[PDB]
Design an enzyme around this catalytic site. Structure first.
Site, mmCIF file in Angstrom:
data_model
loop_
_atom_site.group_PDB
_atom_site.id
_atom_site.type_symbol
_atom_site.label_atom_id
_atom_site.label_comp_id
_atom_site.label_asym_id
_atom_site.label_seq_id
_atom_site.Cartn_x
_atom_site.Cartn_y
_atom_site.Cartn_z
ATOM 1 N N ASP A 10 0.724 -1.594 0.024
ATOM 2 C CA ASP A 10 0.474 -0.374 -0.109
ATOM 3 C C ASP A 10 0.957 1.392 -0.471
ATOM 4 O OD1 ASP A 10 -2.475 -1.790 0.485
ATOM 5 O OD2 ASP A 10 -1.567 -1.566 2.558
ATOM 6 N N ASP A 121 -16.978 -2.682 -0.052
ATOM 7 C CA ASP A 121 -16.600 -2.234 1.258
ATOM 8 C C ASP A 121 -18.156 -2.268 1.884
ATOM 9 O OD1 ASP A 121 -14.244 -1.559 0.077
ATOM 10 O OD2 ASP A 121 -14.472 0.200 0.574
#
Length: 224
Positions: A10, A121
């Site tokens: 990330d 999500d």
């Protein structure tokens, strides 16, 4: 087949991050590859959060890999997708765009097939995004829409792992499901691997690996 593992890198401000920096994204990616990774999940957090990008750096990392690459972060229009695909990545993840521009997502699924996976999500049974629209509506309405648009794959994040949510998404589709987030132990990975017959294909793991909670070697053993 065994559960696929997708160790994450990330990227924020040129660094592999958690707050904590793990230094070079390229070194981090190469380390996973050396430890037996079959996949790399490479994320542009700056693009995802609207604080710039790491496009050139991510391209360099992707070019260095000999393994499969999955890219995510700020991929929301034709030009950002074109750059992402030009890395030779195996696929990309679209998140916010599914919520905000459903017609664009439908178009790029039709054009690119399973080069596209859609990230969902889920807080409870409603969806959430990193853009301006905070409420994305009912999970099942969106799954039906994307199913019928030919969406090849879903990446599912809750909000360790929500095994009930994963199984509920598996029930709603005949497309592969990839678990993302909430992995904090090898036992979490074993639990997710128990859902492979239900249609869970893989698990993305970031935090727990950088923290040295378990090694990628231990993780691959646990899912073998």
């Amino acid at each position: 087949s065994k559960l696929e593992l997708l160790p994450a890198v990330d990227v924020r401000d040129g660094q592999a991050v958690r707050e904590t920096s793990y230094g070079s994204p390229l070194e981090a990616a190469l380390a996973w590859q050396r430890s037996g990774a079959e996949w790399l999940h490479l994320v542009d957090l700056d693009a995802a959060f609207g604080t710039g990008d790491n496009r050139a750096l991510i391209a360099e990392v992707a070019q260095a890999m000999d393994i499969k690459v999955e890219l995510s972060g700020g991929i929301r229009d034709d030009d950002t997708l074109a750059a992402a695909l030009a890395t030779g990545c195996t696929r990309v993840n679209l998140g916010t765009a599914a919520l905000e521009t459903p017609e664009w997502v439908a178009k790029v699924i039709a054009e690119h097939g399973d080069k596209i996976a859609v990230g969902l999500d889920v807080r409870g049974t409603t969806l959430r995004g990193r853009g301006w629209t905070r409420d994305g509506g009912d999970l099942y309405e969106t799954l039906d829409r994307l199913n019928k648009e030919g969406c090849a794959r879903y990446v599912v994040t809750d909000i360790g792992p929500n095994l009930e949510l994963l199984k509920n998404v598996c029930a709603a589709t005949d497309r592969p499901v990839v678990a993302s987030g909430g992995v904090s132990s090898l036992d979490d990975l074993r639990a997710i691997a128990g859902l492979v017959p239900a249609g869970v294909e893989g698990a993305i793991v970031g935090k727990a690996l950088y923290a040295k909670a378990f090694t990628l070697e231990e993780a691959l053993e646990a899912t073998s």
